[PDB]
Every structure is written in structure tokens, then in C-alpha cells.
């Protein structure tokens, strides 16, 4: 289970289990993907089409 996220001409992937820091705010859900062991990258992603497993994981309705 991976999520594609190409910034421009460089494809990047972020794991859902490694994204510890996460908080919903505004339209774009911000997050802090751990990748460096000290640098800690950071980005965001709009909620126009988030994965199906990400919405069920955080939003545990039933």
C-alpha cells in the first residue's frame, strides 16, 4: 500500500504507516512524512481524491 505523489518531474512515494505526524486543517491535508532521521520532509495533498484506505484508517466510522 503506497501513495504516489510526484512533485514535478521526480516521482516520490510516501508510506501511510510512516506518516506519524498528521493533522487535518484547511483543504489540503498537511502531514510530516518521516524520511531522513532528522531532516523530516514535509508536504501536503489536496482531498480531491485521497486513497480509500487512508480515509477508512483515519476516519474510522464503522
Curated annotation (Swiss-Prot):
One MF term in the entry's GO annotations: DNA binding
Gene3D superfamilies registered for this protein in UniProt: 2.40.50.40
Disulfide bond sites: none
Entry-annotated residues carrying N6-methyllysine: 4, 6
Keyword match Disulfide bond: no
Protein's UniProt keywords contain DNA-binding: yes
Changes after translation: Lys-4 and Lys-6 were found to be 60% monomethylated. ADP-ribosylated by endogenous proteins in vitro.
Keyword tags: ADP-ribosylation, DNA-binding, Endonuclease, Hydrolase, Methylation, Nuclease
EC number(s) on file: 3.1.27.-
A Pfam family it matches: 7kD_DNA_binding
Reported function: Can constrain negative DNA supercoils. May be involved in maintaining the integrity of the genome at high temperature. Has RNA endonuclease activity with a narrow substrate specificity; the cleavage products are 3'-phosphooligonucleotides.
Subunit text: Homodimer.
Family: Belongs to the 7 kDa DNA-binding/endoribonuclease P2 family.
The name this protein goes by in its record: DNA-binding protein 7a
Species of origin: Saccharolobus solfataricus (strain ATCC 35092 / DSM 1617 / JCM 11322 / P2) (Sulfolobus solfataricus)
Amino acid at each position: 500500500a503506497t501513495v504516489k505523489f510526484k512533485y514535478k518531474g521526480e516521482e516520490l512515494q510516501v508510506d501511510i504507516s510512516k506518516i506519524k505526524k498528521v493533522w487535518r486543517v484547511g483543504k489540503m491535508i498537511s502531514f510530516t512524512y518521516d524520511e531522513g532521521g532528522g531532516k523530516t520532509g514535509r508536504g501536503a495533498v489536496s482531498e480531491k481524491d485521497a486513497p480509500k484506505e487512508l480515509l477508512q484508517m483515519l476516519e474510522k466510522q464503522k
